[PDB]
Design a protein around this ligand. Structure first.
Ligand SMILES: C=CCn1c(=O)c2cnc(Nc3ccc(N4CCN(C)CC4)cc3)nc2n1-c1ccc2c(n1)[C@@](O)(CC)CC2
Length: 261
């Protein structure tokens, strides 16, 4: 076993259909890695194409500060293994639960910090004629030291701008024009998803998957936030979920905004 040899398990940090993720040490280099172990997906299944899209996206992108780093993947005995950088602060989805439990939330400064950082990530990815297509707290990762680095993960849904093979992301974060199968402005669907991601961080109530409250949002109505936020900022989130995707800012656009530091 390459796994049982090259690495040593310190902590289970994920459990589910996919399988299990583990905090591990590379025996060779003594650095910490997140390694995921999955059953070989069914041929012709979305699990497999996800797997397939991630391989390609890893091959193209190489390395970026705001993208969780790919190191390696391989097989043993009808199981996939993927070795990625380990982010010690967990997923934003976790951090938000933590923020429920201590009756805290992300103060506007941190929301702005969050938005811009995941912004630089999308800029790089879009710049490389790719789109992520499943942006959500669950798939944003946090590396702490003080400083905080936000890193985009899970590229199972990454496809080309040119010839888009669209696996529908989480419905809670999905822009209307993607449900309609309009794939002409997918860069602006990542943008849509990032706004709602940020809204979750503000302590918004769990987002609808469907029903009245869902179409309300896609009509450009920002979901209610407990805490109070600046006019400048509130309007930027609002435009990021504009019904017309052309009217949403690009990644490039987003990371050149005074309201952000
Ligand atoms: C290599 C696989 C993907 N993956 C990363 O690339 C990645 C990078 N940093 C990290 N850090 C991390 C560090 C602590 C935790 N928990 C959070 C919950 N706590 C109670 C206990 C500690 C989670 C995550 N996790 C990564 N992954 C990953 C860990 C758990 C899960 C996932 N990913 C999933 O998103 C896999 C689909 C769902 C569960």
């Amino acid at each position: 076993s390459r796994y049982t040899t090259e690495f040593h398990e310190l902590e289970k940090i994920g459990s589910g259909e996919f399988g299990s993720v583990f905090k591990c040490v590379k025996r060779l280099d003594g650095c910490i890695y997140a390694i995921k172990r999955s059953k070989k997906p069914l041929a012709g299944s979305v699990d497999e194409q996800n797997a397939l899209r991630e391989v390609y996206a890893h091959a193209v992108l190489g390395q970026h500060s705001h993208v969780v780093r790919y190191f390696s993947a391989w097989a043993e005995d009808d199981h996939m293994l993927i070795q990625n950088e380990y982010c010690n602060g967990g997923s934003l989805a976790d951090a938000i639960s933590e923020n429920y439990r201590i009756m805290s939330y992300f103060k506007e400064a941190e929301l702005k910090d969050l938005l811009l950082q995941v912004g630089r990530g999308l800029r790089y990815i879009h710049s490389m004629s790719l789109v992520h297509m499943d942006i959500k707290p669950s798939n944003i990762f946090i590396s702490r030291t003080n400083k905080v680095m936000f890193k985009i993960g899970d590229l199972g849904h990454v496809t080309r701008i040119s010839s888009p093979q669209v696996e529908e992301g989480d419905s809670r974060f999905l822009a209307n024009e993607v449900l309609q199968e309009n794939y002409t402005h997918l860069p602006k669907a990542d943008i849509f998803a990032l706004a709602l991601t940020v809204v979750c961080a503000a302590g918004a109530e769990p987002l609808p998957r469907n029903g009245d409250q869902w179409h309300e949002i896609r009509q450009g109505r920002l979901p209610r936030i407990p805490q109070v936020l600046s006019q400048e900022f509130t309007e930027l989130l609002k435009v990021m979920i504009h019904p017309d995707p052309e009217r949403r800012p690009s990644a490039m656009a987003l990371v050149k905004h005074s309201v952000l530091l």
